[PDB]
C-alpha cells in the first residue's frame, strides 16, 4: 500500500516503479534524483500512497558538498511517464504513447495538482521537462544534437540556462480557470540544446492544466537542431530543481496528488 524511497538509506540513487496494477509495466516511476550532490547530511524520502495517489517527498539536507559546482542545481527529485533517457527507468502504463517521434505525436494536456513547500528561501523550481532524442528508447545520455525542453510553472532564485529569447503566450487552465500567463523563453547548449519556458506568474500550489503542444512547438521554431521533427519526445518528467552552487542547506517539502496526460486530437507540432 505505501511505496517508500530514501537516501541515503537506498544508496545515492533510490528510485522505484509505480505500477498499481501489479502488471509490469509501470504507470509513472519515482527517482529521488540528487544527481549533483557528492556528500550531505540528512535525509531525502519520498512516500507513494498506492491506496490515494499522494505522492509526497520530504527533504532536509545539510553540510551539502556538490559533485561539480559548474551544474548549478543539486538534484531535481521527480515523478516521470515515458522512458528516462539517462538510465534504464521506465514507465509506459498510460495513454499517450511515448517514446515516439515528434512528428507522429498528438497534441495532449498535462494536469498536475500539487503543492510546495521550500524552507528558508531555498531556490527552487517545480519543472516539467522532456528529452528529445536521434533514438527511439535512449538510456545512456544526451548527444549534442538533441535537446532537453524544460516548463517551470513555479519558481524561486533560479535563472534557467542561457539567455533569454522572447516572451510567449499559453493559455492555460489554473484552479479551474482557463487564463492566458506568459512564460519567458530561454536557450542555452550546454552539451545539448536546451530550452526553457519560465512562468513570469509562479504557482506555488493548486491544479494546472497546460497544452503541451504550445511549449514544443516553440522548442521547434527556435531550435538550431537539424531534422527537429524526427526527433522522438522520450519522456515527460516532473519534479523540482532546488540549490545553487552558494547553497549548502536545503530543506523542502512537497506533494503531487494527481498527474493526467489528457490526448487531443491534433498534432504535437503546429
Ligand atoms: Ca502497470
Known amino acids: 500500500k505505501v511505496l517508500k524511497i530514501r537516501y541515503p538509506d537506498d544508496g545515492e540513487w533510490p528510485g522505484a516503479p509505480i505500477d498499481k496494477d501489479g502488471d509490469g509495466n509501470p504507470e509513472f516511476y519515482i527517482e529521488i534524483n540528487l544527481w549533483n550532490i557528492l556528500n550531505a547530511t540528512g535525509f531525502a524520502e519520498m512516500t507513494y500512497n498506492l491506496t490515494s495517489g499522494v505522492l509526497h517527498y520530504v527533504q532536509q539536507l545539510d553540510n551539502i558538498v556538490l559533485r ?15 522512458n528516462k533517457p539517462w538510465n534504464a527507468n521506465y514507465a509506459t502504463d498510460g495513454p499517450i504513447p511515448l517514446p515516439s517521434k515528434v512528428s507522429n505525436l498528438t ?8 503543492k510546495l513547500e521550500p524552507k528558508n528561501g531555498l531556490p527552487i523550481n517545480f519543472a516539467i521537462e522532456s528529452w528529445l532524442t536521434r533514438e527511439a528508447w535512449r538510456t545512456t545520455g544526451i548527444n549534442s544534437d538533441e535537446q532537453e525542453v524544460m516548463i517551470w510553472i513555479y519558481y524561486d532564485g533560479l535563472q534557467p ?4 529569447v522572447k516572451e ?15 512564460f519567458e523563453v530561454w536557450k542555452a547548449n550546454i552539451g545539448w540544446e536546451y530550452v526553457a519556458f519560465r512562468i513570469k506568474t509562479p504557482i506555488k500550489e493548486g491544479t494546472v492544466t497546460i497544452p503541451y503542444g504550445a511549449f514544443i512547438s516553440v522548442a521547434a ?46 498534432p504535437l507540432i503546429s
Open 161 to 164: 540556462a542561457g539567455s533569454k
Open 168 to 182: 510567449i503566450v499559453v493559455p492555460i487552465i489554473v484552479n479551474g480557470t482557463p487564463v492566458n500567463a506568459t
Open 221 to 266: 521554431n527556435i531550435s538550431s537542431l537539424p531534422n527537429y521533427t524526427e526527433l522522438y519526445l522520450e519522456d515527460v518528467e516532473i519534479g523540482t530543481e532546488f540549490g545553487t552552487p552558494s547553497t549548502t542547506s536545503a530543506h523542502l517539502e512537497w506533494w503531487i496528488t494527481n498527474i493526467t496526460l489528457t490526448p487531443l486530437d491534433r
Open 107 to 114: 497534441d495532449f494536456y498535462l494536469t498536475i495538482s500539487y
Open 68 to 82: 561539480d559546482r559548474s551544474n548549478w542545481v543539486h538534484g531535481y527529485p521527480e515523478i516521470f511517464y515515458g
